Amino acid sequence: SLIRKKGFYKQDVNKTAWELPKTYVSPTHVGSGAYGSVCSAIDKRSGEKVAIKKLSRPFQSEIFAKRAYRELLLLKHMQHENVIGLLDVFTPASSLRNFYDFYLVMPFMQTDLQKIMGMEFSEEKIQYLVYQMLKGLKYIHSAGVVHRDLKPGNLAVNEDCELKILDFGLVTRWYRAPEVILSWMHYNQTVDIWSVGCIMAEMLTGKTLFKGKDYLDQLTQILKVTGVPGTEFVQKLNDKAAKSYIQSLPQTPRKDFTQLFPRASPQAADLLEKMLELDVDKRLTAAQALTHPFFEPFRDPEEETEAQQPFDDSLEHEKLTVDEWKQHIYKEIVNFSP
Numbered sequence: 117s118l119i120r121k122k123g124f125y126k127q128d129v130n131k132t133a134w135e136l137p138k139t140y141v142s143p144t145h146v147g148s149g150a151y152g153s154v155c156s157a158i159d160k161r162s163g164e165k166v167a168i169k170k171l172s173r174p175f176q177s178e179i180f181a182k183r184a185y186r187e188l189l190l191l192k193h194m195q196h197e198n199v200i201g202l203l204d205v206f207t208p209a210s211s212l213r214n215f216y217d218f219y220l221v222m223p224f225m226q227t228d229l230q231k232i233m234g235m236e237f238s239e240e241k242i243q244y245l246v247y248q249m250l251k252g253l254k255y256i257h258s259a260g261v262v263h264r265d266l267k268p269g270n271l272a273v274n275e276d277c278e279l280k281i282l283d284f285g286l287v288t289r290w291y292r293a294p295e296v297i298l299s300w301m302h303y304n305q306t307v308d309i310w311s312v313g314c315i316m317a318e319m320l321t322g323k324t325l326f327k328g329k330d331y332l333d334q335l336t337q338i339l340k341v342t343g344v345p346g347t348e349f350v351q352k353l354n355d356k357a358a359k360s361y362i363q364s365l366p367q368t369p370r371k372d373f374t375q376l377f378p379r380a381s382p383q384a385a386d387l388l389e390k391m392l393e394l395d396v397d398k399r400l401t402a403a404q405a406l407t408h409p410f411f412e413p414f415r416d417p418e419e420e421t422e423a424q425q426p427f428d429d430s431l432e433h434e435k436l437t438v439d440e441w442k443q444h445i446y447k448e449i450v451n452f453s454p
């Protein structure tokens with residue numbers, strides 16, 4: 117029986133107490149979150165700077181425990197250059213009564229696209245970053261995982277503009293796909309692609325593509341760009357009141373993204389045209405978008421790997437006790453290996 121595992125030291129970071137193994141030193145506050153808090157650390161073994169997320173009361177309720185367990189499994193499962201990954205997992209706990217939280221160790225990423233958004237962005241930078249997003253998205257989608265909430269803040273970058281896809285947690289819906297906002301038809305993996313389009317557009321222009329007070333105001337702003345959709349799309353809607361409403365609009369024709377984005381190159385506008393597509397059957401997939409000529413100078417098919425196995429959480433549907441979730445999280449931590 118112990119207070120904490122041997123080789124664990126106690127230390128305040130951002131006015132909260134942290135419990136870190138001796139191998140991780142110089143903890144430095146990065147940010148506070150909805151479900152935890154992050155610091156940066158130096159791994160004395162190799163001198164590399166890492167990020168560490170402290171889970172905040174993950175066992176306060178079944179919802180929290182399942183959430184914390186899910187993030188742990190996703191990060192473990194994803195093995196790709198442009199997806200954030202797990203380097204290590206630990207808890208200072210020595211038993212199950214002792215188990216109150218756990219920590220995740222990840223590659224440290226200096227900043228994100230939200231923070232550096234507004235440096236005008238040359239096409240080469242956009243080409244390079246959007247190419248990395250798409251690779252990351254091809255990978256996770258190939259594992260059967262969709263992001264659903266992709267945005268500049270969920271896109272981490274370093275000095276070299278190397279990109280890693282994040283999901284910081286779970287209002288503004290500027291990057292959300294219309295079919296999600298309006299639930300007017302069922303969505304597929306290309307919901308994330310609509311988000312890439314919105315982000316790319318913003319990098320091209322400097323300004324957010326689609327805002328709005330409410331969903332109908334955002335739909336209006338969207339249709340300005342996509343034009344009012346015709347017969348083939350309207351038929352697919354499962355929302356009668358939406359189908360009606362659309363058919364009642366001034367049927368304003370679409371596009372010439374050359375006009376809408378008067379600075380964009382023909383290949384840029386063309387790809388934009390294909391990601392910002394209302395019909396979720398016509399919208400580009402990640403693998404399809406990777407083949408676009410816009411990524412000609414950067415494309416390397418070997419880099420565009422897929423997940424070997426699908427993300428398979430047998431307990432996404434289960435409903436066990438907080439104690440029961442602790443036992444499973446406990447097990448996953450014990451048998452982890454770098």
Ligand SMILES: Cn1nc(C(C)(C)C)cc1NC(=O)Nc1ccc(Oc2ccncc2)cc1
Pocket residue numbers: 146154167168169186187190191194199200222223224225226256261263272281282283284
């Ligand atoms: C739930 N979920 N899903 C994903 C996929 C993208 C693989 C689908 C990732 C996460 N969790 C996460 O990003 N956690 C996280 C993000 C940022 C962070 O803080 C930093 C990490 C690295 N560098 C700086 C800050 C800490 C944890």
